[PDB]
């Protein structure tokens, strides 16, 4: 099954090493052999090669029609295996899309790869499920049905099943402001007359709520500051303030 | 720094900054606003029903509409008598004419709502519509303008609101190169307001002018003569590529049956005077002679078919498309709209509205830190790239510069524009006047008027004064206009005009309370007596009136209407 | 199939649209002794076809 | 250059650099916090050209 | 990667030996600032799986003769890199000013 982790690996481990083929197992039989169990095959550096390759091809024309000048191609994939990021680099020499190499965990080799029919152009949550063939130089050959998505790459073959999580790289791409915001924030025009402040002092403001509302000839003109961090008020409701006054200091939460 | 993607992921993910995430919390404030909106739409959505099947509302529970009680029996009697004749008294001709499963617009509706005051003080003229019904229709794979003359002849065929509606339809069709279909039923002319409707310009002659200027540009037009069209109404059957005369009740006259009397009054049958004469007469007038209403409508459809526009429309507007909905529920559009009748202007937002209307809830901001008052950027509306100008606050010189720059880019790359009107908001500070604010306002208006891009405006609310000149206005050729219920179109000041005109009007220093009762209350009554419901649409000021919730569908109709253009 | 214009009037001459293997066509076929009205109808048809 | 001609030197930010403080100048369409952000906005602007 | 060739076996190129350490120091100082010193901006900008041309390359190869008789000005490129790039399904010209301001 692909898509959700299962205990199928556990059950097989419960069947191979434990000598319960004899037939005598107690009610607490599971308790003592917990050290022996909960064990899965080690992801060999080769598995990353087929898994990494599938994500590209099963997403775009990477390595397809590629061309540079007096040089050679290069494209890299980052895997977040366990709690340690993993980098795999793939490149070609010659005029061959077929001849491909790899270098993961300081291990280098060569292989060729032949794909199958292109499927799932819509690349939805299910993404693309295609069979792959890989001829490594040593001499082997492999077949791998890879349903790859942005979240993970799942490879199923004679090795078994392994899903490799892709290193997540997302963090409010845009709104990344570390500015101190010391003074001159949400300054109001000359008329002043601040009132009806609906924000608590020392509370985080990342979304642009109405920090202060000042009225200038029936002009609420809400400031709507979007500077991240807690906002500290130096004014009180009903207090007439001068032009460009420091009504509050919007500073990073420290 | 430990960050090396290829732009996508950062893009093509459900986490791009392009989108918008204003999620409401449904608090009292939301309720106060959301509820009112609901209080501002129910009847809007209702009067429509009442004028539809006008004057015959069997429920008799139309108290949600402030419309006065009318004699239902008289209207039902008239409709029974008319339907006994053999012709369908309704808009039924239209939905019979348009292909099933297709769209419709109803361009101008509630036209002539309680417009004229009769001799009876408590009675207005019962013009449930403008006398016609106008909407964009898609016939046989061809987009067309549909104009149908209603059988309401009790007040008279055409009014200053009827000819204006017809001429607006003709101008729209000519601009957009949509062929017209006219359904003709007339009582002749109105010999009471004839000075107001016959002479001068932009009158009944301009209809004849347009029906020839169109055929110069080879934009074929079709008319169906269901009943009499006298008093200059007989030229449309004569000025027509194809015309249809029903076998029995279809009549065309240049001189009335009473007119032969008192001038060689050898009266003969109304058939021989110019009506449908199916006897192989010498006259080659009228292309189609159809025995029944269905036969006539069918021949109209068949003639519409042989125009070769199907290929061109199918190529220009893709028929098979995948709808992309916004990320947030369109029912929430009424909530972000504030309440009404509030002494001081309430607060307002735009991001939420655009995030609710556009495709995928996304936006492409230009400079927003600078000239924080005005909002401009690209978008997506059902597979088509759009530019939006939505106003928020009091305009500055820099806001005008940013608007001019945006309009420059949009004209450069041929991107349509959408307008969301708001307050005037011209600062009056002396330093601002000394900073050449008038020059920058001129900079904005010059670009607005000079743009050859198709332009549509929709009223958000509070469009009062000369500020609309900065964004857009009816006098700046918007190919369509639509309105929300909470709209006020008035003098340069909605609330301040009260304060200013209080000072300078023959007021003694004393009697202050009686004076403010006579001045401020009176000017408030004057400047909010006008509103979305009456002063607009009924007078074909901003002819379209819509709901805030269904705005994107309407704007998508408009944009598909403006791509057959040359 | 055929798309008749006025056939009760100027019954001599025949004019209307058609279809010939996926292409819209106009046909003028003559039947009888021409009148003035037949000439008018022909002129009107040719006007539409050119338009 | 400000020195030796009214040399009231101030910060290089105020002399014309990236001034993200809502200055009066409407110069420069995009203000991006990072290299990736700037490249991404460049790509996004390139997108809306209809080519 | 002008002036930084860690292999130090570039005898196949008749180029004279240059101070690799100085160029590496300059690149380290520049990258510490927070901006990518390379043509990296380009291949980040162009869609993956697409083509590139590099219109003019080796520009300003050993062009100017300095005051030092055995030394030429170290213009590894013309100061810019130019190539045809396909961005977001749109073909575009890409011109990038290199951070070489030493000359
Ligand atoms: O902050 C104070 C300035 C208030 C400006 C009010 C604007 S100026 C033009 C327009 N007409 C009015 O009555 N109010 C607005």
Cβ–Cβ of E44/B1 closer than 8 Å?
A: no
* Three-class HEC string of chain A: CCCCCCCHHHHHHHHHCCCHHHCCCCCCHHHHCCCCCCCCCCCCHHHHHHHHHHHHHCCCCCCCCCCCCCCCCEEEEEEEECCEEEEEEEECCCCCCCEEEEEECCEEEEEEEECCCCCCCCCCCCCEEEEEEEEECCCCCEEEEEEECCCEEEEEECCEEEEEEECCCCCCCCCCCCCCCCCCECCCCCCCCECCCCCCCCCECCCCCCCCCECCCCCCCCCCCCCCCEEEECCCCCCCCCCCCCCEEECCCC
8 A C-beta contact, residue B147 and residue B132: yes
User: Residue B399 falls within a domain, yes or no?
Assistant: yes
Tell me which of B258, B287, B316 is where a domain ends: B316
Among B216, B287, B303, B309, the strongest candidate for a mutation testing the C interface, having the largest count of C CBs within 10 A, is: B287
Strand A160-165 relative to strand A231-233, pairing: unpaired
Q: Are residues B459 and B539 in the same domain?
A: yes
Quickly list H helices, B414-483: 430-434, 437-450, 468-471
Q: In the Cβ-directed half-sphere of B188, how many Cα atoms lie within 13 Å?
A: 15
Cβ of A66 and E57 within 8 Å? no
State how far the Cα of D34 lies from the Cα of B563, in Å rounded to an integer: 40
What is the per-residue DSSP string for B24-88?
A: ----HHHHHHHHHHHHHHTTHHHHHHHHTTTT--TT--TTSS-PPP--HHHHHHHHHHHHHTTS-
Whether the CB-CB separation of A236 and A179 falls below 8 Å is answered with: no
The DSSP result for C3-37, as a single string, is: EE---SSSTTEEEEEEEETTEEEEEEEE-S---HH
Q: Is there a single domain that holds both residue B69 and residue B195?
A: yes
Whether residues B359 and B507 fall in one domain? yes
Residues 11-40 of D with CB under 8 A from E: 35-36, 39
Alpha helices (H) in B239-284, listed in sequence order:
257-260
- β-strand B417-421 against B384-391: which pairing, if any? parallel
Does residue B254 sit in the same domain as residue B164?
yes
d(CA B55, CA B126): 8
What is the dihedral sign for C-alpha B92, B97, B102, B106? negative
* Residue B343 CB burial class (10 angstroms; 0-12, 13-18, ≥19): exposed
What is the separation of C-alpha D26 from the centre of its chain, rounded to a whole number of angstroms? 10
CATH number of domain containing B377: 3.90.226.10
- H/E stretch holding B143: strand B142-149
By C-alpha distance, which of B186, B197, B173, B284 is closest to B236? Answer: B186
* Residue B34 belongs to a domain: no
- Identify which of B452, B470, B447 has the alpha carbon closest to the alpha carbon of residue B399: B470
The answer to whether E51 contacts A60, with C-beta atoms less than 8 Å apart, is no
Nearest-angstrom CA–CA distance, A199 and E82? 52
Could you give the CA distance from residue E82 to residue E92 in angstroms, rounded to a whole number? 11
Verify that B237 and B373 share a domain, yes or no: no
> Which residues of chain A make contact with B393, given a CB cutoff of 8 A?
219, 221
Q: Is residue B23 part of a domain?
A: no
Do both B358 and B262 map to the same domain?
A: no
d(CA B148, CA B184): 7
Contacts (Cβ under 8 Å, ≥6 apart) of A181: A227, A229, A249, A250, A251, A252
Distance, C-alpha B242 to centroid of its chain: 28
- At D51, is the secondary structure helix, strand, or coil? coil
Q: Which long-range contacts (CB under 8 A, 24 or more apart) does B38-47 make?
A: B38/B334, B40/B334, B40/B340, B40/B485, B40/B486, B41/B334, B41/B485, B41/B547, B41/B548, B41/B549, B44/B485, B44/B533, B44/B545, B44/B547, B45/B547, B47/B110, B47/B113
Place of tokens 């003080």: B121
Using an 8 Å Cβ cutoff, are B152 and B193 in contact? no
Domain membership of residue B90 (yes or no) is yes
- Considering only CA atoms, which of A2, A115, A1 is closest in space to residue A58? A115
Would you give the distance in Å from CA A220 to the centre of its chain? 42
Q: SS3 for B19? A: strand
Instruction: Answer whether E77's CB lies under 8 Å from E100's CB.
Output: yes
Q: Among the residues of chain D, which ranges form H helices? A: 35-47
Q: Find the Cα–Cα–Cα–Cα dihedral B183, B189, B194, B196, rounded to 10°.
A: -10
Q: Which residue range forms the structural domain that includes residue B87?
A: 43-316
| Angle, helices B204-216/B162-176, rounded to nearest 10 degrees | 10
Taking CB atoms and an 8 Å cut-off, how many pairs form between chains B and D? 43
Q: Is the distance from CB of B396 to CB of B427 less than 8 angstroms? A: yes
- Count CB atoms within 10 A of the CB of residue B460: 24
Domain total of chain B: 2
CA distance B489 to B545: 14
Q: Is residue B356 domain-shared with residue B406, that is, in the same domain?
A: yes
Sign of CA dihedral A98, A101, A104, A109: positive
CB A190 near ligand 1, within 6 Å? no
Question: Is there a domain that residue B1 lies in?
Answer: no
The rounded distance, in Å, linking the Cα atoms of B312 and B566 is: 12
Q: Is residue B41 within 8 angstroms of chain A, CB to CB?
A: no
Alpha-carbon distance B286 to B253, whole Å? 13
B265 plus B386 within the same structural domain: no
Find residue C20's DSSP bridge partners: C23
**Min Cα separation D2/chain A (Å):** 27
**Distance (Å, rounded) from C-alpha B26 to C-alpha B4?**
40
Distance of alpha carbon E68 from alpha carbon E63, whole angstroms: 14
The H-or-E segment that residue B115 falls in is none
Same domain, B283 and B384: no
Is residue B125 within 8 Å of B95, Cβ to Cβ? Answer: no
Contact B256, B235 (CB under 8 A): no
Q: Which residues of B touch A150 (CB under 8 A)?
A: 9, 13
* Of A190, A232, A178, A234, residue with least CA distance to A214: A190
The answer to whether the beta carbons of residues B486 and B337 sit under 8 Å apart is: yes
Q: In this structure, what token pair is assigned to residue A60?
A: 């775009």
Give one word for B540, left, alpha or beta, with left for phi > 0 and alpha for psi -120 to 50.
left
**End-to-end distance of chain B based on CA atoms, in angstroms?**
52
Q: Looking at the structure, tell me whether residues B336 and B312 fall in a common domain.
A: no
Which residues does chain E have within 8 Å of residue A60's beta carbon, measured at their own beta carbons? Answer: 48-49
Strand pairing of A142-148 and E90-97?
A: unpaired
Largest CA distance in chain B: 101
CB–CB of B6 and E34 under 8 A? no
Q: DSSP secondary-structure letter at E56?
A: B
Q: Cβ of B126: how many Cβ atoms within 10 Å? A: 21
Measured distance CA(B17)–CA(B43) in Å, rounded: 39
Q: Which long-range contacts (CB under 8 A, 24 or more apart) does D24-30 make?
A: D24/B398, D25/B370, D26/B367, D26/B370, D26/B371, D26/B398, D26/B401, D26/B402, D26/B405, D28/B367, D29/B366, D29/B367
CA atoms within 13 A on the CB side of A183: 3
Residue at B30 is within a domain: no
Beta strand spans in B409-511 (E)? 417-421, 455-459, 480-483
The reply to whether C8 touches chain B by the CB within 8 Å rule is yes
Neighbours of B220 (CB within 10 A): 18
CA geometry: angle at B97 spanning B95 and B103, to 5°? 55
As beta bridge partners, residue C3 has C17
Helix axes B397-413, B437-450, angle to 10 degrees: 20
User: What SS3 class is residue D46?
Assistant: helix
Strand partners, B46: none
> Bridge-partner residues for B447, per DSSP?
none
Which residues of D are less than 8 Å from E87 in CB distance?
Answer: 43, 46
Q: At what angle do helices B28-41 and B44-51 cross, to 10 degrees?
A: 10
Distance in angstroms (rounded) separating the CA atoms of residues A188 and A217 = 13
User: What's the rounded Cα separation, in Å, for the pair B292 and B86?
Assistant: 8
Q: Tell me the HSE value of B428 on the side-chain side, using a 13 A CA sphere.
A: 6
Instruction: Give Cα separations from B376 to B389, B410, B418, B441 (angstroms).
Output: 5, 11, 10, 16
Min Cα–Cα distance to chain A from E69, Å? 31
> Are B309 and B342 within one domain?
no
Mark which residues 337-376 of B lie under 8 Å from D by CB: 364, 366-367, 369-372
Of B367, B370, B385, the CB nearest to D48: B385
Name which of B480, B482, B493, B459 is nearest B337 in CA terms.
Answer: B459
B50 with B158, same domain? yes
Structure-block tokens of residue D44: 């996004």
Task: Please report whether residue B14 resides in a domain.
Answer: no
**Pick from B274, B290, B316: which residue ends a domain?**
B316
Of B115, B131, B156, give the one whose Cα is nearest residue B54: B131
Instruction: Tell whether B543 is covered by a domain.
Output: yes
Q: Which is it for the CA torsion B163, B168, B174, B180, positive or negative?
A: negative
* Furthest CA-CA distance within chain C: 34
Q: Tell me the backbone φ, ψ of residue C50, rounded to 5 degrees.
A: -65, -35
Length, in residues, of chain D:
51
Which of B283, B316, B349 represents a domain boundary (last residue)?
B316
Which residues contact residue E94 at a Cβ distance below 8 angstroms, ignoring those fewer than 6 apart?
A: E42, E45, E46, E81, E82, E83, E84, E85
Query: Cβ(A56)–Cβ(A50) under 8 Å?
Result: no
Structure tokens that stand for B290 in this block: 């159809």
* Residue from A127, A131, A151, A150 nearest A141 by CA: A131
């Amino acid at each position: 099954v692909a898509g959700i982790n299962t205990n199928i690996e556990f059950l097989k481990r419960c069947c191979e090493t434990p000598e319960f083929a004899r037939g005598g197992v107690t009610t607490n039989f599971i308790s003592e052999h917990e050290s022996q169990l909960l064990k899965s095959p080690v992801v060999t550096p080769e598995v990353a090669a087929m898994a990494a390759t599938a994500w590209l091809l099963n997403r775009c024309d990477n390595w397809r029609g590629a061309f540079r000048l007096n040089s050679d191609t290069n494209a890299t994939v980052h895997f977040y295996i366990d709690d340690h990021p993993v980098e795999v680099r793939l490149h070609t020499e010659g005029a061959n899309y077929h001849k491909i190499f790899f270098s993961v965990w300081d291990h280098d080799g060569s292989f060729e790869v032949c794909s199958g029919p292109v499927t799932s152009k819509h690349r939805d949550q299910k993404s693309i499920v295609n069979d792959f063939t890989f001829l490594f130089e040593n001499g082997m050959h492999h077949t791998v049905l890879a349903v790859a998505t942005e979240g993970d790459v799942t490879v199923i073959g004679s090795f078994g099943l392994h899903q490799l999580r892709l290193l997540p790289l997302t963090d409010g791409f845009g709104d990344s402001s570390t500015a101190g915001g010391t003074s001159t924030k949400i300054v109001s025009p000359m008329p002043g007359k601040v009132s009806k402040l609906l924000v608590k002092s020392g509370d985080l403001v990342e979304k642009g709520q109405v920090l202060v509302i000042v009225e200038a000839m029936k002009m609420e003109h809400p400031v709507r500051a979007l500077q991240d961090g807690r906002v500290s008020f130096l004014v009180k409701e009903g207090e007439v303030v001068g032009g460009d006054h420091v009504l509050a200091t919007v500073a990073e939460e420290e | 720094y430990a960050h090396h993607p290829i732009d996508y992921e950062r893009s093509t993910s459900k986490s791009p900054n392009i989108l918008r995430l204003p999620a409401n919390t449904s608090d009292p404030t939301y309720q106060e606003n959301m509820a009112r909106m609901e209080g501002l739409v129910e009847q809007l959505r209702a009067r429509v029903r009442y004028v539809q099947a006008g004057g015959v509302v069997p429920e008799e529970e139309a108290a949600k509409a402030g419309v006065s009680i009318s004699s239902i029996e008289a209207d039902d009697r008239v409709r029974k008598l008319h339907l006994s004749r053999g012709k369908m008294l309704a808009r039924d001709r239209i939905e019979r004419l348009i292909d099933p499963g297709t769209r419709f617009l109803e361009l101008s509706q509630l036209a002539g709502w309680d417009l004229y005051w009769d001799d009876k003080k408590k009675e207005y003229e019962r013009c449930y519509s403008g006398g016609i019904v106008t909407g964009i229709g898609l016939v046989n794979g061809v987009r067309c303008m549909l104009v149908a003359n209603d059988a309401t002849v009790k007040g008279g065929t055409y009014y200053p609101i009827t000819v204006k509606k017809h001429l607006r339809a003709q101008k729209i069709a000519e601009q957009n190169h949509l062929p017209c279909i006219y359904l003709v039923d007339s009582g002749g002319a109105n010999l009471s307001r004839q000075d107001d409707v016959f002479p001068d310009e932009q009158h009944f002659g301009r209809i004849f002018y347009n029906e020839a200027q169109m055929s110069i540009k080879s934009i074929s037009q079709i008319a169906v003569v269901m009943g009499s069209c006298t008093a200059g109404g007989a030229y449309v059957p004569a000025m027509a590529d194809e015309n249809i005369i029903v076998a029995r009740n279809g009549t065309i006259f240049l001189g009335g049956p009473p007119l032969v009397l008192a001038a060689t009054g050898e009266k003969v049958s109304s058939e021989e005077l110019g009506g449908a004469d199916v006897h192989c007469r010498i006259s080659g007038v009228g292309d189609h002679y159809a025995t029944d209403d269905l036969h006539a409508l069918y021949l109209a459809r068949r003639a519409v078919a042989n125009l070769n526009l199907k290929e061109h429309n199918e190529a220009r507007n893709p028929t098979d498309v995948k709808p992309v909905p916004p990320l947030y529920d369109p029912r929430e559009l009424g909530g972000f709209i504030p309440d009404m009748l509030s002494d001081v202007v309430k607060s307002f937002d735009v991001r939420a509205i655009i995030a609710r209307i556009v495709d995928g809830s996304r936006f492409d901001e230009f400079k927003a830190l600078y000239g924080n008052t005005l909002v401009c950027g690209f978008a997506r509306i059902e597979g088509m790239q759009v530019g939006i100008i939505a106003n928020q606050g009091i305009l500055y010189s820099e806001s005008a510069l940013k608007g001019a720059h945006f309009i420059g880019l949009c004209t450069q790359r041929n991107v349509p524009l959408l307008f969301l009107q708001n307050i005037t908001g011209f600062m009056v500070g002396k330093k601002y006047e000394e900073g050449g604010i008038a020059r920058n306002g001129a900079r904005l208006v010059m670009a607005v008027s000079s743009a050859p891009v198709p332009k549509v405006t929709v009223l958000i609310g509070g469009s009062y004064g000369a500020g609309n000149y900065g964004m857009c206005g009816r006098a700046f050729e918007p190919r369509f206009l639509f309105m929300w219920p909470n709209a006020r179109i008035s003098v340069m000041g909605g609330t301040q005009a009260a304060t200013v005109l209080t000072l300078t009007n023959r007021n003694l220093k004393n009697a202050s309370e009686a004076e403010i009762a006579a001045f401020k209350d009176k000017v408030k009554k004057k400047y909010e007596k006008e509103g979305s419901c009456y002063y607009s649409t009924a007078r074909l000021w901003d002819d379209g009136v819509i709901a805030p919730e269904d705005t994107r569908v309407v704007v998508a109709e408009a944009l598909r209407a403006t791509r057959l253009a040359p």
